[PDB]
């Protein structure tokens, strides 16, 4: 119950947030942009995943 | 009378004093007398209660007694009923405001005086002295004494010719000043005469 709420709030999206439509060189700097305070947890973004 | 008193030789180093006050030559003797009185009274009273050490300490015209006993419950009785009673009598004896504290003696088998007392009691109620001695020694050892010695003397088993017998176990260094040697004595007033019981209990060496 708690963990599906944490995931459903995490992997979602909104039509404008901090860092809308910026491009990221990996998931590591995705978490670094979430922690430093430069993007939001749900902000649509092109990443490069492997 | 060969040996030095083990407490007495160590008062400056590892053992402390019982009466702990300052007084000028004027009031000192009187103070001593008072101490003697109060202590005597306490012994008389708390015979059935296992009492090891009465520590008197008088600051500012007011006497602070500290009774070290194995069972506080019998000395205290009901909470602040017996202690209170004791206090006023102590005060009377002294002629000043009294204050009784009661320290609880952890491990009465390792306290020497208590052991001695027990032995004396046993002797009085007509047990085999030797068996009592053994018990005393064994118990202490079990409890974690680095060593113990006990000695009993005179009219043993009501025999006409008096003698002394003693049991040591572990190590009991008396010449070593830094050794915590709890020494104490007692006297069994039996039907055949007095039987004196000495007991040395070596807790361990102090390093400073």
């Amino acid at each position: 119950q708690d963990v599906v709420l944490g995931l459903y709030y995490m992997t979602r999206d909104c039509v404008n947030a901090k860092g809308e439509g910026m491009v990221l060189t990996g998931p590591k700097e995705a978490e670094r942009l979430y922690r430093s305070g430069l993007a939001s947890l749900h902000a649509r973004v092109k990443v490069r995943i492997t | 009378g060969q040996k030095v008193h083990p407490n007495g030789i160590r008062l400056g180093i590892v053992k402390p004093w019982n009466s702990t006050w300052f007084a000028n030559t004027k009031e000192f003797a009187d103070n001593l007398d008072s101490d003697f009185k109060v202590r005597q009274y306490l012994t008389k009273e708390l015979a059935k209660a296992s009492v090891s050490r009465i520590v008197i300490e008088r600051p500012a015209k007011s006497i602070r007694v500290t009774i070290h006993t194995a069972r506080p419950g019998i000395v205290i009785g009901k909470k602040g009923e017996d202690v209170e009673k004791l206090r006023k009598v102590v005060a009377d004896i002294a002629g000043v405001p009294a204050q009784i504290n009661i320290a609880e003696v952890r491990k009465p088998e390792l306290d020497a005086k208590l052991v001695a007392d027990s032995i004396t009691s046993q002797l009085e109620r007509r047990v085999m002295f030797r068996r009592a001695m053994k018990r005393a020694v064994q118990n202490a050892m079990r409890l974690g004494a680095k060593g113990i010695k006990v000695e009993v003397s005179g009219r043993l088993g009501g025999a006409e010719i008096a003698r002394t017998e003693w049991y040591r176990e572990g190590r009991v260094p008396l010449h070593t000043l830094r050794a915590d040697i709890d020494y104490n004595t007692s006297e069994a007033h039996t039907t055949y005469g007095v039987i004196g019981v000495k007991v040395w209990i070596f807790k361990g060496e102090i390093l400073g």
């Binding site: - | 500290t66 506080p72 419950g73 205290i76 009901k78 909470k79 602040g80 202690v83 209170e84 504290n101 009661i102 320290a103 609880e104 003696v105 952890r106």
Partner: protein, 230 residues
């Protein structure tokens, strides 16, 4: 490395207890780091003196009642647990409270020594109603940190104490509430600097610059394990 260093520039006392303090200047982003670290340390690990053992005369246990008073003995122990003492020299002192007569027993009636300071002269303890009633308690004030309770202090105590001494729980920490704010600093040539406005709320016994200095030393000596060894 173009960093700077902060200083305690202005220390305003809003009252004797509630008192703010600035910090200036902090670098960019450091404000929430130092503020949260000083908050955690200043709430967990400060030394303050508190009541530990209470000794009332003519008492058996803490669940009895007494002659001539309002609050019962558990109420007296709670009102003594709230006390705020500030010793200077020793680390373990014994106070004395003696009072007779009809009226409330404030904290200002304790016969103080020289190096103890009771900073709440309106802290009520008892409400003596009979004029023939008396109360003579002897408090014991240790000094530590954190929270050490009666159950753990039931066997921890080594010094064989006599029976009749009521054991009160020890709330040692004199900090109760702390908030920090990261404003915009007014630097005449820099715009990317900030100030930290720590808003403490003490027990009255602790001096805020001394508390901040001690928390800073705690943090630096904790980080020395990272600095020196690897």
């Amino acid at each position: 490395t173009e960093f700077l260093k902060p200083r305690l520039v202005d220390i305003e006392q809003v009252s004797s207890t509630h008192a703010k303090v600035t910090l200036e200047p902090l670098e960019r982003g450091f404000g929430h780091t130092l503020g949260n670290a000083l908050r955690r340390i200043l709430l967990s690990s400060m030394p303050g003196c508190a009541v530990t053992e209470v000794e009332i005369d003519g008492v058996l246990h803490e669940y009895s009642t007494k002659e001539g008073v309002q609050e019962d003995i558990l109420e007296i122990l709670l009102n003594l647990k709230g006390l705020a003492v500030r010793v200077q020299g020793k680390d373990e002192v014994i106070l004395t409270l003696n009072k007779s007569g009809i009226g409330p027993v404030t904290a200002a009636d304790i016969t103080h020594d020289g190096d103890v300071e009771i900073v709440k002269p309106q802290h009520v303890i008892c409400h003596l109603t009979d004029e023939n009633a008396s109360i003579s308690m002897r408090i014991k004030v240790q000094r530590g940190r954190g929270y050490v309770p009666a159950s753990t202090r039931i066997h921890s105590e080594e010094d064989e104490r006599p029976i009749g001494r009521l054991l009160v729980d020890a709330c040692y920490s004199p900090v109760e509430r702390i908030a920090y704010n990261v404003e915009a600093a007014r630097v005449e040539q820099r715009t990317d600097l900030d100030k930290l406005v720590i808003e403490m709320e003490t027990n009255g016994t602790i001096d805020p610059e001394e508390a901040i200095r001690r928390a800073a030393t705690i943090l630096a000596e904790q980080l020395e394990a990272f600095v020196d060894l690897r």
